[PDB]
Amino acid sequence: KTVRWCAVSEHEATKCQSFRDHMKSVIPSDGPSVACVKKASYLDCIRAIAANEADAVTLDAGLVYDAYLAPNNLKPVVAEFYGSKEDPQTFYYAVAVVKKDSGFQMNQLRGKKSCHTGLGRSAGWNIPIGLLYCDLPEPRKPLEKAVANFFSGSCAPCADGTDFPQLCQLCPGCGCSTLNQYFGYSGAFKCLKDGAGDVAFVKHSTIFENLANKADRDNYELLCLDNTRKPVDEYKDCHLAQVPSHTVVARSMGGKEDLIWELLNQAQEHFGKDKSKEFQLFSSPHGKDLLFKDSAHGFLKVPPRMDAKMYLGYEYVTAIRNLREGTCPE
Ligand SMILES: [Fe+3]
């Protein structure tokens, strides 16, 4: 009855131990417990789970494509929901955040410096790059190199800085964890805030999570598809796409999914949004989106018959498959 959670680097491990410890106090001795496995990146976590060294890790939907392929063969078991309990959203919006008065529109992105959440993630990579690779009559389509030559420097966490130094320009090394200050949604927004990049590819709640007062948020806007900018509150009218929720994944067979659910259900019940002043499941003095997204309000069980392809949808998986092949309509 021990769920082995795969923590990615230092901060997550810190929060995971605090997760383990607090659960120990509200769950009966015969109930599920948490064990923490620290890994270097999400990829190691996927391998560890498939190799039966850990049992669970939360992933952005785009990374669910990787966990699914053999030899990994992982499946989503618990999805995060955003918004509220009364109105649970199992999707979010990918947006392009720029500083106010920077001048460029969606079509003048070449030559800019970009800030991405991570390589392979929905909002930070799949959505934005998906939208512009084919619009490049230039067949330098083996992605990384095309992107590396499209922008004049980026921070694409988890990318290979040895073959593509340009991709790690804004964050030397392209570290794939929170140890990289420019990692994740808030890492990418910071990359723009710090003025290291001209555009951050994040989600609609990112800025709200980072800039408390409207005053500062006014120094920012969003790039829309029709080549017009708009206020950060107009994300419903100005966003790149709607993507599925981050989901906790487990092994397709012998994945301990019941235990995973009871542990998380019990956790949201005890430390969910608003629940406890002792320990918050969706926030941490040690950082943002550690283990789960700070923007989540709870967890929902994924229907048992639902596999990765059904979870992502036909359009997304195909888009992802095509993206990684540079395939573009002839
Ligand atoms: Fe995401």
- 270 within 8 A of 276, measured Cβ to Cβ: yes
Residue 121 CA, ligand 1 centroid: distance in Å: 6
Q: Domain spans of the chain?
A: 1-81+247-308, 82-246
**CA 155–ligand 1 middle distance (angstroms):** 16
Is 272 annotated in a binding site? The answer is no
State which fold the 82-246 domain adopts.
D-Maltodextrin-Binding Protein; domain 2 (3.40.190)
Cα–Cα separations (whole angstroms), residue 310 to 64, 69, 254, 303: 11, 14, 21, 10
End-to-end CA distance of the chain: 53
DSSP code of residue 284 = -
User: What is the rounded CA–CA span in Å between residue 81 and residue 90?
Assistant: 5
- Cα 236 to ligand 1 centre (Å): 17
Pair of tokens at residue 319: 């888009």
Gap between the Cα atoms of 321 and 105, Å rounded? 28
d(CA 267, CA 262): 8
Angle at CA of residue 174, ends 130 and 177, nearest 5°: 100
1-81+247-308: in CATH 3.40.190.10:
yes
83 CB burial (10 A radius; 0-12, 13-18, 19+)? middle
C-alpha span between 170 and 182 (Å, rounded): 8
Cα of 29 vs centre of ligand 1, distance in Å, is: 35
Experimentally, how was this structure solved? X-ray
Burial category of 112 from C-beta neighbours within 10 Å (exposed 0-12, middle 13-18, buried 19 and up): middle
Amino acid of residue 212:
A
Residue 61 C-alpha to ligand 1 middle, in angstroms?
6
CA-based Rg of the chain, rounded to a whole angstrom?
A: 19
Transcribe 25-48 into DSSP letters.
HHS-TTS-EEEEEEESSHHHHHHH
Beta strand 296-301 with 74-83 is: antiparallel
CA distance 169 to 205: 26
Residues with CB under 5 A from ligand 1 (ion): 60, 122
Which residue type does 209 have? E
Header resolution in angstroms: 2.5
Domain 82-246 in the same topology as domain 1-81+247-308: yes
Q: Tokens in use for 218?
A: 């006014």
Classify residue 9 by burial, with Cβ atoms within 10 Å: 0-12, 13-18, 19+: buried
